[PDB]
Design a protein around this ligand. Structure first.
Ligand code: ZN
Length: 18
């Protein structure tokens, strides 16, 4: 499990403004 936007496994998909 991780981010469904960029994929980086660390932050979820709420603070993915990077
Ligand atoms: Zn992300």
């Amino acid at each position: 499990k991780g981010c469904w936007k960029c994929g980086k496994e660390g932050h979820q998909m709420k603070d993915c403004t990077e």
